[PDB]
Design a protein around this ligand. Structure first.
Ligand SMILES: CO[C@H]1O[C@H](CO)[C@@H](O)[C@H](O)[C@@H]1S[C@H]1O[C@H](CO)[C@@H](O)[C@H](O)[C@@H]1O
Ligand SMILES: [Ca+2]
Length: 455
């Protein structure tokens, strides 16, 4: 039976989806304020990202309609450059999850076609993949000013390629992504398990040495060490070792406490200088920590998970709209009249990102503490109050500090339906058998993939 809060999530989903159907059907993203759409893949991104969410929420007539579009309209031969990481976590991941939940081999067929078109990205001197690959022409290349790739981008594609190999029996996917993981396992230039942001595709070595963040460009490296370890049946001890090492590195080098509330937060390090800057992206970490504890990581990880969950909650509730901005700054020393969570004017956007509600889901699953459900409901009510578009859809906003003029940006990112509402639906569920942590691991875009239950 669905409960009150899950029904609320479904209502939000269906209001979002009626905008997508009316104004953006088959297109990458809804622009709900202007009742139009944008493309970058041209591959129905929001539709693919929401397949498994529709299935999970019981939206079966919508799922059927979307499946028909996948069957007749999804084609990968266009002359278009795609980012390998975004392609992998959203489209390859979303198709694999749709396959597993529905049992419909259409989704696997499409996944295999797509994965084969991404493989030219790995054709580099070091076998660290280029950032971009053209799925129609087979040409892959780095960005225009550099032969570096982003460390998170090359280390956050493994679940999907590993699973694709398992399902298809074609080893090329697994072999390509596992080479990357094994290579990075042996690289110099880490700080107590912390990785730099960039890696050169010619030399295979890290660049931008001495600069450490758990936010953009590095965050999901850590997430995918743990998740690959779980996926593989907990038999790949190097992944676990590198994860355990990295968490101690976080404790040693990046953790500080805010003023006035003494909240634990994760900052950035540049040539030994600490910076109290924290991307909302870093709020993945409490959930990943708690996930690890469920799977046997040390209790110290749970203490840190609970502290960071409170901080991420405050990053939301200390804003006038109750929604976290893209980037916050904390004060290490007392500042008269200031809250814990400071926000630069440029950073005040909210893009409907999932990381807080993602981590609330894990913290509730592992602890059973219903306050985490309450916190997620609070955030959802804030989404409804300040980002809802009457004709359909929800929009990113430019000013989380102005409840009267939040200033919509006219875009519904695919991860609102792929991630934010999925995690909220699961957070509110009365059923631990629903996508059990014993049976699935979620990829970087909330697409559940089966755990390889071991020998
Ligand atoms: C710019 O930040 C994004 O890209 C870098 C890699 O260039 C990642 O390190 C970072 O996690 C995010 S991707 C992240 O963003 C969305 C949620 O905010 C969503 O696509 C998904 O969760 C993805 O992991
Ligand atoms: Ca993510």
């Amino acid at each position: 039976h669905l409960n009150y809060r899950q029904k609320g999530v479904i209502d939000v989903f269906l209001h979002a989806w009626k905008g997508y159907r009316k104004f953006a059907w088959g297109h990458d993203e809804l622009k709900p304020v202007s009742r139009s759409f944008s493309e970058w893949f041209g591959l129905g991104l929001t539709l693919i990202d929401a397949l498994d969410t529709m299935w999970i929420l019981g939206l079966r007539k919508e799922f059927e309609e979307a499946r028909k579009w996948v069957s007749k309209k999804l084609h990968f031969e266009k002359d278009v450059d795609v980012n390998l990481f975004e392609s992998t976590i959203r489209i390859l991941g979303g198709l694999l999850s749709a396959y597993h939940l529905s049992g419909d081999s259409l989704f696997l067929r499409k996944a295999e076609d797509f994965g084969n078109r991404l493989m030219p990205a790995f054709r580099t001197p070091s076998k660290i993949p280029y950032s971009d690959v053209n799925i129609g022409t087979g040409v892959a290349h780095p960005p225009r000013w550099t032969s570096d790739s982003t460390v998170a981008e090359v280390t956050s594609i493994q679940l999907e390629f590993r699973e694709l190999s398992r399902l298809t029996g074609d080893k090329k996917f697994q072999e390509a992504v596992e080479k990357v993981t094994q290579h990075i396992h042996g690289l110099s230039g880490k700080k107590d398990g912390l990785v730099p942001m960039f890696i050169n595709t010619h030399s295979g070595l890290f660049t931008h040495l001495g600069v450490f963040t758990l936010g953009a460009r590095a965050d999901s490296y850590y997430e995918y060490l743990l998740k690959q370890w779980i996926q593989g049946g907990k038999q790949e001890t190097q992944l676990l070792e590198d994860y355990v090492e990295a968490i101690e590195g976080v404790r040693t080098h990046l953790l500080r406490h805010s003023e006035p509330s003494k909240l634990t937060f994760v900052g950035e390090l540049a040539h030994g200088r600490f910076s109290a800057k924290m991307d909302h992206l870093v709020c993945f970490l409490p959930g990943t920590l708690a996930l690890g504890v469920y799977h046997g990581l040390p209790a110290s990880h749970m203490e840190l998970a609970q502290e960071l969950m409170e901080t991420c909650y405050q990053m939301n509730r200390q804003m006038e709209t109750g929604l976290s901005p893209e980037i916050v700054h904390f004060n290490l020393y007392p500042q008269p009249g200031r809250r814990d969570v400071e926000v630069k004017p440029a950073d005040r956007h909210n893009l409907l990102r999932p990381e807080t509600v993602e981590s609330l889901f894990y913290l509730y699953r592992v602890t059973g503490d219903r306050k985490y459900q309450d916190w997620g409901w609070e955030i959802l009510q804030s989404f409804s109050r300040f980002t809802r578009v009457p004709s359909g859809g929800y929009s990113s906003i430019n000013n989380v500090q102005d409840p009267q003029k939040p200033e919509p940006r006219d875009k519904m990112e695919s991860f609102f339906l792929g991630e934010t509402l999925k995690y909220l639906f699961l957070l509110f569920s009365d059923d631990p058998n629903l996508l059990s942590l014993d049976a699935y691991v979620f990829n970087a875009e909330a697409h559940p993939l089966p755990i390889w239950t071991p020998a």
